[PDB]
């Protein structure tokens, strides 16, 4: 009966952890495209 009580709050904790992992995926995309930008940038300043 006590685990049956605890489910109600545990579900919200797991939900928020899922949300933060979605944020981590978006920041992984951003860090990838920014690093690719910096690589082409050093190619640019090497051209200058």
């Amino acid at each position: 009966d006590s685990i049956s009580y605890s489910n109600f709050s545990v579900a919200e904790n797991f939900q928020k952890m899922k949300d933060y992992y979605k944020e981590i995926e978006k920041l992984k995309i951003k860090i990838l495209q920014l690093i690719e930008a910096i690589k082409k940038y050093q190619q640019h300043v090497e051209e200058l």
Partner: protein, 37 residues
């Protein structure tokens, strides 16, 4: 006969002495009633 005040006081203590509220508070927290908007 009639009943006066002190009879009602001691009778409420006698009848209220027996019952247990703990199961009912446990029953109103059952999986059949736990979210209540």
């Amino acid at each position: 006969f009639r009943l006066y005040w002190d009879d009602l006081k001691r009778k409420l203590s006698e009848k209220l002495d027996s019952t247990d509220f703990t199961s009912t508070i446990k029953l109103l927290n059952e999986n059949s009633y736990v979210p209540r908007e």
